Nucleic acid binder design. Structure first.
Ligand code: MG
Ligand code: MG
Ligand code: MG
Ligand code: MG
Ligand code: MG
Ligand code: MG
Ligand code: MG
Ligand code: MG
Ligand code: MG
Ligand code: MG
Ligand code: MG
Ligand code: MG
Ligand code: MG
Ligand code: MG
Ligand code: MG
Ligand code: MG
Ligand code: MG
Lengths: 97, 63, 127, 25, 226
RNA sequence: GGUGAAAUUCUUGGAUUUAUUGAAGACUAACUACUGCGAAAGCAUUUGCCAAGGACGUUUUCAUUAAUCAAGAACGAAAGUUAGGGGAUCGAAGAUGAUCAGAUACCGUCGUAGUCUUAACCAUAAACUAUGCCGACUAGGGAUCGGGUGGUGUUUUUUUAAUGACCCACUCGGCACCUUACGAGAAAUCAAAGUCUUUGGGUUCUGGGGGGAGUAUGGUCGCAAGGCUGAAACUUAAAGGAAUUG
RNA sequence: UGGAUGGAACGAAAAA
């Protein structure tokens, strides 16, 4: 029987969504169906910050960011310890943690 | 063949496929204020002293 | 007052590249990769390997006369992973601890404007 | 066996019957 | 993989740094600082004449060093070597560009991006391509959480930017323009020209790319390095 | 270089790498969301030209000119065919290295047809919201797109005006969403899948247990792969849907 | 202010 209201995506009124490729397994997947995540991370670490800061010119330089968007197929997303599973009525929950 | 004396300051938890290895945050006797995280084989508490064949390696932390 | 070089770490998977060049970039100095300091064929990207190579290249840098370096980190890019490898990050900390000075770190991973085609077929790498 | 491959096998069988019929007429 | 060579030689030592000497790169007048860096090449032998090997080189340097102030932190600058004057090889402008981390931080979702480009020509026969970028701004007292444009404001804004770039480059030779962009007066004009259309916060311009060069004319270059 | 681990491959004739240029073809990233347009398939760089369209506004006109439709007709994803051009990347067939008892499969490196474009064909899909179209009525909440109206509302221009962008109130037309079930259902669920034993607003198409079988035959289109229409003999007591406990 | 993919594994006579 039907398992989800949107049936696994966010397509209502389009028909075609111009798919993209999974970052890991390169499987094709519609853009809206994909499980896009935003990876914003500082360049170095939370550990070597002291080393670089002391061993660098330009005191208090920037420590800039790094931004990648990731797209996983459903199977890769489940296999990579992400949003895995939820119970029957709990699936309806929409908000992030 | 130089070696390094390092002092354990805080134990993290067990690690390894069979639970036979321990993760510790250890702190050098000489040139203090530097702390590194290493794996230990045998039984260990805090405040122990370790000797290292090398100092420049930080083990894969699982947290 | 100071002498600068340019690092250009290639933080790929399965291997790691470290070679410093002149500020112009046409002249290269002491190209050492992690794969020439181990005998595994599996550890070529290991952080220990990259660190050990980074110390070597830092030795050549110091004995030539370069004291500080500008950092350009980059991944495989193109249609491939676009995420930095494991050992390049360790190499950066290595050569920084080796004695040189650091300034103006940037990421130069080649990113396309929706390039041609990712390999693997429509249905993806199946394993 | 899977329905698609059933359909493909039938299509081949039809093609073979078609040509063997055309062999005589 | 040290022992992995099955065959090292398809068919079947000298230290290279004893042959190499340093050189000092000089920037044009339109910069607070002049000392850029240092570079290595071989002996200018009777068959190489290393000045030839230096003739077509490009060096990238951050603007923050050239101006001292750290507000020009990202702001990469490209300089082209043109003439070798006794270990003080000279350079002129070749291109400006943004840093990836900044560029990516410019763009955030739930707002409208506006982009424009142009292929204007200078008085000095230089042919330049300039890019401009903008993003919509949600004002103070905003309640709705996305604040998109209406795709006709974008058309008007892009038209205004396109024409204003030309009107700012036509007549100008090069160096005035360099000293217009160091204090970023160009983007300063944009909101004054567009505030009656839509807010448009954060109107930094973009990289600029050079396309075509006229004849050398040594003297003009020398004028920059007094 | 590749993987879980390796090998086929390329390297002292300098591979991988770094800088400066140049050429070719493909795509239009990040902005990009329970947002938009189109009858559907589908459609994401700028600018110009050509024609088209919905909604809104209207104290303009015709006056019932309308809804659904046998026969008939336009469009119709991808793959595929014929003849030119183009032919970077990926890549059915194929060649090869691994794993395995076997592995012409999954994994790795190459690689024709194809992937792009012009002139024609083909007319199928899980072409899906598995919910035909038109019209009326029936519960609450906020948010959003396009238009219109009111408000000493905020900001900016020239404090100030008209603008523009926001705020508050209202309305028409959209894509939907949150709560509840008077009601419906076998249930999953549904503001329609409701106003159906208290059984009737108008209308088109399709089905009568599962196989045999979308097969055979006969028509009809196509160069071809195939498309449209479409049986029977015989066999069988279960197939099937939704939920409960293991 | 974090972070790992990760090898091989075929089959079980009829009725209750
Ligand atoms: Mg199921
Ligand atoms: Mg569809
Ligand atoms: Mg080479
Ligand atoms: Mg785009
Ligand atoms: Mg839109
Ligand atoms: Mg009708
Ligand atoms: Mg059909
Ligand atoms: Mg159907
Ligand atoms: Mg209705
Ligand atoms: Mg409205
Ligand atoms: Mg509405
Ligand atoms: Mg709608
Ligand atoms: Mg019957
Ligand atoms: Mg029947
Ligand atoms: Mg069932
Ligand atoms: Mg058997
Ligand atoms: Mg068997």
């Amino acid at each position: 029987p039907k398992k989800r209201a949107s049936n696994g995506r966010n397509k209502k009124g389009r028909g075609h969504v111009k798919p993209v490729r999974c970052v890991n397994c390169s499987k094709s997947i519609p853009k809206d169906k994909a499980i896009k995540r935003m990876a914003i991370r500082n360049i170095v670490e939370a550990a070597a910050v002291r080393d670089l800061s002391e061993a660098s010119v330009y005191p208090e330089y920037a420590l800039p960011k790094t931004y990648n968007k990731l797209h996983y197929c459903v199977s890769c997303a489940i296999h990579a310890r992400i949003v895995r599973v939820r119970s029957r009525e709990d699936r309806k929950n929409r908000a992030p943690p | 063949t130089p070696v390094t004396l390092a002092k354990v300051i805080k134990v993290l938890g067990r690690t390894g496929s069979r639970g036979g290895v321990t993760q510790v945050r250890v702190e050098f006797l000489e040139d203090t204020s530097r702390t590194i995280v290493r794996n230990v084989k045998g039984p260990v508490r805090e405040n122990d002293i370790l000797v290292l064949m090398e100092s420049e390696r930080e083990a894969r932390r699982l947290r | 007052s100071q002498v600068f070089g340019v690092a250009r770490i290639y933080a790929s998977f399965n291997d790691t590249f470290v070679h410093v060049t002149d500020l112009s970039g046409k002249e290269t100095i002491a190209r050492v990769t992690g794969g020439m300091k181990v005998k595994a064929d599996r550890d070529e990207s290991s952080p220990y390997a990259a660190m050990l190579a980074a110390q070597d290249v830092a030795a050549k840098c110091k004995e030539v006369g370069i004291t500080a370096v500008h950092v350009k980190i980059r991944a495989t890019g193109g249609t491939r992973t676009k995420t930095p490898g494991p050992g390049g990050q360790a190499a950066l900390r290595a050569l920084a601890r080796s004695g040189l000075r650091i300034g103006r770190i940037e990421d130069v991973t080649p990113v396309p404007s929706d390039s041609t085609r990712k390999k693997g077929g429509r249905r993806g790498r199946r394993l | 066996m899977r329905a698609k491959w059933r359909k493909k096998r039938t299509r081949r069988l039809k093609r073979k019957r078609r040509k063997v019929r055309a062999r005589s007429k | 993989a040290v022992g992995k060579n099955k065959r090292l030689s398809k068919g079947k030592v000298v230290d290279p740094f004893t042959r190499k000497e340093w050189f000092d790169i000089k920037a044009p007048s339109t910069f607070e600082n002049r000392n850029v860096g240092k570079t290595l090449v071989n002996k200018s032998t009777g068959l190489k004449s290393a000045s030839d090997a230096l003739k077509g080189r490009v060096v990238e340097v951050c603007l923050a060093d050239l101006q001292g102030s750290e507000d020009h932190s990202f702001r990469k600058i490209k300089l082209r070597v043109d003439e070798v004057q006794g270990k003080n090889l000279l350079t002129n402008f070749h291109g400006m560009d943004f840093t990836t981390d900044k560029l990516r931080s410019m763009v955030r979702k739930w707002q409208t991006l506006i982009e424009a480009n142009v292929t204007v020509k200078t008085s000095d026969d230089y042919v330049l391509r300039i890019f401009a970028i903008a993003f919509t701004r949600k004002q103070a007292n905003q309640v709705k959480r996305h604040s998109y444009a209406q795709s006709s404001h974008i058309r008007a804004i892009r038209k205004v930017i396109s024409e204003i770039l030309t009107k700012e480059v036509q007549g100008s030779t090069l160096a005035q323009l360099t000293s217009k962009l160091i204090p970023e007066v160009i983007n300063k004009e944009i909101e004054n020209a567009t505030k009656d259309i839509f807010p448009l916060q954060n109107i930094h311009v973009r990289k600029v790319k050079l396309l075509k060069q006229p004849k050398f004319d040594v003297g003009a270059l020398m004028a920059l390095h007094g």
